Amino acid sequence: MRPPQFTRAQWFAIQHIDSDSSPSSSSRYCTIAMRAINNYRWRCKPVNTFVHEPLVDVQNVCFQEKVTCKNGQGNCYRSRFRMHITDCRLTNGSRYPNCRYRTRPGRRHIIVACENRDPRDSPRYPYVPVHFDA
């Protein structure tokens, strides 16, 4: 479950946005970057994608191409441009708290579900991404 102390938009950013990414080209990037996520979980997260772009550019996807969400509801949006991403996949020997990941950089269009900010989210960003849809 999402940790209740974080809004939907906050938890999306924690798990999926890394705008300060100079060690992402390292093979250890995922093992390092997943720690902060797994600290709020009871088992190593098996798979996780980070988007390596400035926050504003990820948020701006919410104003790009509207596409149907996998669940058929809400509002999802596909980035006009491909974005830098890193896919992180848990290794088979991993067992919490020792979570080791394979790091797989790439570039893809991202699809995000977006919605109005929570009251606890900054009012500077009225409409924000809350999930990946692909």
Author numbering: 0 to 133
Task: Quote the passages of the study that discuss this structure, keeping the authors' original sentences.
Based on the structure-function knowledge of the RNase A superfamily we have engineered a chimera that combines RNase 1 highest catalytic activity with RNase 3 unique antipathogen properties. Based on the RNase 1 scaffold we incorporated specific regions essential for RNase 3 unique anti-pathogen activities within the RNase A superfamily. The solved crystal structures confirmed that all the chimera proteins reproduce the kidney-shaped folding typical of the RNase A superfamily and thus keep the fold of the templates used in their design, as suggested by circular dichroism and molecular dynamics analysis. Nonetheless, the structures that incorporated the key features related to RNase 3 antimicrobial activity retained the overall RNase 1 active site conformation together with the essential structural elements for binding to the human ribonuclease inhibitor (RNHI), ensuring non-cytotoxicity.
